[PDB]
Structure formats: C-alpha cells, structure tokens
Design a binder for this molecule. Structure first.
Ligand SMILES: CCCCCCCCCCCC(=O)OC(CO)CO
Length: 138
C-alpha cells in the first residue's frame, strides 16, 4: 500500500523549512510567521490523478497533477513563480522536478505505514517533513 497517499495527514515534524523558504527568496516577515506553522496535507488520489491541498492557519497551497504529465505550476502563496513540473514514480516515491529559475528544485513524497514523508529541495537547502495519518473517530 506504499503508493496509496490518499487521506488527511497532520504534520509531526518540519526540519529546515526556514532554509527552503530562504532559498525561494520568500520575504523575512513571511518566513517569520510561516516557520512556526503546523501544516496539514489533504490528498485525493485516483490512480495517477492527484489533487492535493497543503493547509495552515496562515495560507494554503494547492496543486493538482497527473503522474507522467508535465504541467505549468504557479506557486501561488509560496514564492509565486512559474515552473515546469513533472511528477513521476521512482519506485514507490512520488518525485517532482520543478524546472525554472531556481536550480535543483523539486520534492519527493512517500508513504511508510501511517506516515507521509516529504522532502522539499531548492538549491542547497532540503526541508524534511513528516506527517501522520489523521486519527480516525473514537
Ligand atoms: C509561506 C507560507 C507557507 C504556507 C504553507 C504552505 C506550504 C507549502 C509548501 C510546498 C508544499 C508542496 O509543494 O508539497 C507538494 C507535495 O505535497 C504538493 O503536492
């Protein structure tokens, strides 16, 4: 079930989100708020079609894609840049390459049991996040 990323995932850890945001040139006042925020990931996955929402108390980031289909991603509410994005499977890891102004920009997202791992990369900065599958009703 390592390819099934469906559901709601609640952030457990967030390492070096500051460096990732700084590499994206996000302004200092925004980073000061954003580094503290818990995030939630909501994934609606139907085969290779993904609809994703990353939410917080401050701002949300939405991106939808089909595995294997390059798309024009506009990173609204993050750094507000246009990139050419492609998501593919490398094994059971979902890998996105975002070609554009910033070198070495992309992300890798994968399941281990009840945990979702996400590594966000830009240039020489890597942010490593872990989310836990939302607790089901009592
Ligand atoms: C500056 C305010 C930040 C507000 C929180 C929003 C942060 C989003 C970070 C990028 C997440 C991302 O691209 O993740 C992909 C894989 O999960 C989306 O499919």
């Amino acid at each position: 079930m390592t390819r099934d990323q469906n559901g709601t995932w609640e952030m457990e850890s967030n390492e070096n989100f500051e460096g990732y945001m700084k590499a994206l040139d996000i302004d200092f006042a925004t980073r000061k708020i954003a580094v503290r925020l818990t995030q939630t990931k909501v994934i609606d996955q139907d085969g290779d079609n993904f609809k994703t929402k990353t939410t917080s108390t401050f701002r949300n980031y939405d991106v939808d894609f089909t595995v294997g289909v390059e798309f024009d991603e506009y990173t609204k509410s993050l750094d507000n840049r246009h990139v050419k994005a492609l998501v593919t499977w490398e094994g059971d890891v979902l890998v996105c390459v975002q070609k554009g102004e910033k070198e070495n920009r992309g992300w890798k997202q994968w399941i281990e049991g009840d945990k979702l791992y996400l590594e966000l990369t830009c240039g020489d900065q890597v942010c490593r996040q872990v989310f836990k599958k939302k607790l089901v009703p009592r």
